[PDB]
Point group: C3
Chain length 284, copies 3
Amino acid sequence: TTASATGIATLTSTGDVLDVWYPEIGSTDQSALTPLEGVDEDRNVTRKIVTTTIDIDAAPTDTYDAWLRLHLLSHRVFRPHTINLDGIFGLLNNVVWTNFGPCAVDGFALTRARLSRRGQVTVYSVDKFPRMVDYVVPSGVRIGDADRVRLGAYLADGTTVMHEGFVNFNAGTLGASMVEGRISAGVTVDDGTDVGGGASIMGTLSGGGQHVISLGKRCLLGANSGCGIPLGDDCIIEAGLYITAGTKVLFDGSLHKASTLAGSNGLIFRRDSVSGQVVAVPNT
Amino acid sequence: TTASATGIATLTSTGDVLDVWYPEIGSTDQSALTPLEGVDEDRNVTRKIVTTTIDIDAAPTDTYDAWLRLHLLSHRVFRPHTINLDGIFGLLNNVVWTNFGPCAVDGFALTRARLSRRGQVTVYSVDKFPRMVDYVVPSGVRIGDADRVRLGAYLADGTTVMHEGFVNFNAGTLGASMVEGRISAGVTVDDGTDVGGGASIMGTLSGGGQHVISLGKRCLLGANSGCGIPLGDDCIIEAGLYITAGTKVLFDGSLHKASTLAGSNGLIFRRDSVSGQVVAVPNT
Amino acid sequence: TTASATGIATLTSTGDVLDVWYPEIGSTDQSALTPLEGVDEDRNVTRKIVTTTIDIDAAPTDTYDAWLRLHLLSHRVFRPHTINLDGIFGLLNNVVWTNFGPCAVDGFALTRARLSRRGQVTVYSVDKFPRMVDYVVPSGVRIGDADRVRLGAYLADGTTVMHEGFVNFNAGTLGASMVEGRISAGVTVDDGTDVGGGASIMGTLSGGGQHVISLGKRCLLGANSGCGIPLGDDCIIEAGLYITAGTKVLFDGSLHKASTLAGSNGLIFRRDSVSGQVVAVPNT
């Protein structure tokens, strides 16, 4: 699908793209942005209006195109998995995200020294993905510590991300959800889901499919729980319990790999003291 | 109990209250605050001195009264559960907390554009509760990442909140305590307690009482542990173990719901490899 | 070993040292820093160039010496455990880390009021250790939320610290590593290690040796796991499992304290549904 927008890019003297801000999508209005164009000699960058047009099904081909992809997600124009992001890591620069804006990692010590004549320099982050909220604040959301939501995160109207929640790029919520735990890249949860405090969805060593996971509607993951399998609607994972793809769970009298229960609806995963096993039992 | 204070409110052109700062409680001194009064045309708000008087036992009745309640907690004038907070969620506005101060969520894109003529705009948080430290820094405390303590948190002299700790409103510490994990709203811990790294107190799905919990003195919760029951003094929860209200624990030869041990003193909760159970054993 | 550097100190009118910045180590160039020297009457501090020389094997003896020690670590001049830090807690002041720089905890309310005539005051942290990145951005690293890396952290080239990672002082990575969990003071991990999301290394109640731990090369700790024992190379800890020094693990047909396996290479620690035990099995 064709998509396009007008934004303002921050460029180094090499022409490396540190960032592009697209305040809105599909718009032509350049002169909202003209008074931001210019040179910043302390940072050695220039800011320059650009117009970018892409095909969402093609892999991104340069840095401008990568940035527009992430804005399309966080503006909620497109959902996770409807935009091709292949190769995006090779298109984004590592940047020093400061109170004065993006700065190049090369020669930051000189930049810091020059900027310090204007004020205290604070570094928020050093990464290829900036903090979502500094580019897009989507409507109807709360974010308690906005360090923890990357540009490219999709947060549906009605979502709260608590301070210990985290939402990566190409990930997030498809309806109103309470996110107190960690949503890895590619993962989505649906309406009325509560990801409890410190819970992990698709974390390190949770799975071994060639393929990413999601949760359905009204799933409840307990605090400090984890989930490495796709779940359907109305599933519950007990506080403190990590269900990995390879966890053996007792369901109908025998042990089964949790991956065999992928996509189930209405299951409660919990520890069971009488059997000594993780059990999967029907939710009612 | 009657309480009162003089502060400065930030108001939108509708008269919605974005925030009130009360630098001190019970004071009359208006002209410390007069040079802050004014209009900010970029944000479209005005700042205006107010005096607010409340009864701590009555439910709050407007936004000013809500804000004073949260200041009374974080100034440590009153302890958690001695101030009525019923309805507070309906009195607080969702706000965009920026480096230029509070901004309205409605029309933030225009606000961001106007503010950007003065400097880089950074959004810290989008929420109904601001970061405590921007209103009150209570004496004798350390806070490693101050995104993680909400205004309304009560931190006793001698408390350290580590970077992965979190303290909600109406919650916190009643004596000198090390907080490396997460204290939900309504929860308090007492003197010499260590909430270990990533531990959860009263998290999502930890309990099913009609009622909130607390820990006593000198409780030690291991890293990545959890507790969904009130505990007395000198209790220990093993690292990595979540004790929910419904967890079956082996105590005196039989299995009991952990809720039956609510308020105990001197218990160690740990996994036991010879029984395959969570055991509760006497601390000595 | 003798070490020295030129920096700029922030001093209160008592001469208490709030911070020292040493932009580079072993250098004489004072006049890069002269235009920063001065008085800040709102904060009541002065900034003053200093030259500091220490012996890395001697305990630190004043505040300047403490600060240089932490810079030597985060500049990667010396590795964790090659600099004596005994007594450092008594040499560092508790500071209010603000957007205007370090401020004294004593009389902060007056400082906040004075600074507010220049702009919104934001408090980032209140602690004895500042945020590493505001003093040193080491080359070749990404840090998603830079609140979570203390000055004194050693991050090897090629390291990513994700937003829920944390690295204390005198701790970190000895080669390229993915840090998504929490590295306590004194702990190091080596090349190709992945500390999964929310994992804890040497957290509260994980151990009872008189002595700190480390992980070797290519160790994989699952999300929400924990480790309280030194491990060698190529070890794996299952997602959701905490291996404490006192955890009983099944290895060769009998139960052994995990501390007896300290320093092993090529072990996989996982829950085993058929035995009901934590097992340690060979990695291949």
